[PDB]
Amino acid sequence: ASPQSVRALLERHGLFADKRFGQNFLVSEAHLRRIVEAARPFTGPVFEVGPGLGALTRALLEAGAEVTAIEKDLRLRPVLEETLSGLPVRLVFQDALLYPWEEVPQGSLLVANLPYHIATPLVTRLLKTGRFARLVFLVQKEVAERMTARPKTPAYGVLTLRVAHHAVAERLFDLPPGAFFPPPKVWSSLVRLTPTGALDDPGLFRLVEAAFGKRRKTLLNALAAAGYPKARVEEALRALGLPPRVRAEELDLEAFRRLREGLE
Ligand SMILES: CSC[C@H]1O[C@@H](n2cnc3c(N)ncnc32)[C@H](O)[C@@H]1O
Numbered sequence: 001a002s003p004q005s006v007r008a009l010l011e012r013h014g015l016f017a018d019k020r021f022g023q024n025f026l027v028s029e030a031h032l033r034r035i036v037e038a039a040r041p042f043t044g045p046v047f048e049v050g051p052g053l054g055a056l057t058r059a060l061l062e063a064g065a066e067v068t069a070i071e072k073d074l075r076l077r078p079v080l081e082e083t084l085s086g087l088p089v090r091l092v093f094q095d096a097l098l099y100p101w102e103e104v105p106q107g108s109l110l111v112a113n114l115p116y117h118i119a120t121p122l123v124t125r126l127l128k129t130g131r132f133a134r135l136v137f138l139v140q141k142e143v144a145e146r147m148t149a150r151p152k153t154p155a156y157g158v159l160t161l162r163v164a165h166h167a168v169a170e171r172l173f174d175l176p177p178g179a180f181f182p183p184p185k186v187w188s189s190l191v192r193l194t195p196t197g198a199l200d201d202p203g204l205f206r207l208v209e210a211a212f213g214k215r216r217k218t219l220l221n222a223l224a225a226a227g228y229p230k231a232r233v234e235e236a237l238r239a240l241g242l243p244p245r246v247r248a249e250e251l252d253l254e255a256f257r258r259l260r261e262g263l264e
Pocket of ligand 1: 021022023024025049050051052053070071072073094095096097113114115116118
């Protein structure tokens with residue numbers, strides 16, 4: 001893969017990169033290799049969402065992964081068949097947001113150059129399945145920052161705590177716009193999530209989502225606004241030794257879990 005090879009491949013197939021599909025294709029073989037290495041060992045079947053021109057798909061397959069590749073853009077079928085000629089892969093033409101994720105084998109892996117517009121809801125769904133051993137994927141740098149944020153930083157929020165609840169999170173490296181054709185407007189990052197097997201905790205997330213809803217308020221006032229009894233919230237913060245005017249972004253996962261318990 002190279003900027004010239006990718007441009008040439010698109011042109012030969014009559015393709016354009018379509019923004020409606022968030023198409024930005026990997027253009028660096030070295031980066032492809034680093035993504036594959038980050039996903040090893042392939043202890044379970046691999047799912048790739050958005051195989052595109054098949055560059056990562058081919059590298060995964062050559063590394064011995066058993067791959068299902070889910071692509072929404074049917075126009076990519078000819079180039080994918082060409083790229084993957086002779087190689088065992090399940091190509092599925094479907095919107096990945098509609099794929100039956102809850103039924104994948106326990107121990108499955110995700111390895112993907114995700115389209116920006118589905119990355120957050122897709123990863124959130126896959127985490128809620130509890131079916132994955134590892135998820136390795138590209139997201140915009142700001143989204144990687146949310147997924148790996150520490151408390152009291154701009155990026156810290158509901159997505160940080162959603163990820164933390166289910167999985168260990170790592171931002172492994174960043175990729176400049178030039179690693180893709182066409183180049184996006186922002187940097188990307190390779191994120192690795194390793195699930196602990198924890199499933200959704202809807203009560204905890206009702207609390208977390210209420211906490212971050214009203215961004216201008218203290219935590220107490222945010223939760224009171226969402227219908228939590230104020231006296232009960234006051235007492236629970238106090239019992240935890242937290243300042244009365246503590247803000248939502250100052251609490252870590254442990255603190256939210258204990259706040260929840262105090263309230264019930
Ligand atoms: C970053 S390149 C994104 C890849 O994902 C594909 N894609 C975009 N939207 C979806 C979706 N909902 N399901 C599966 N693949 C998608 C694009 O066509 C491209 O190959």
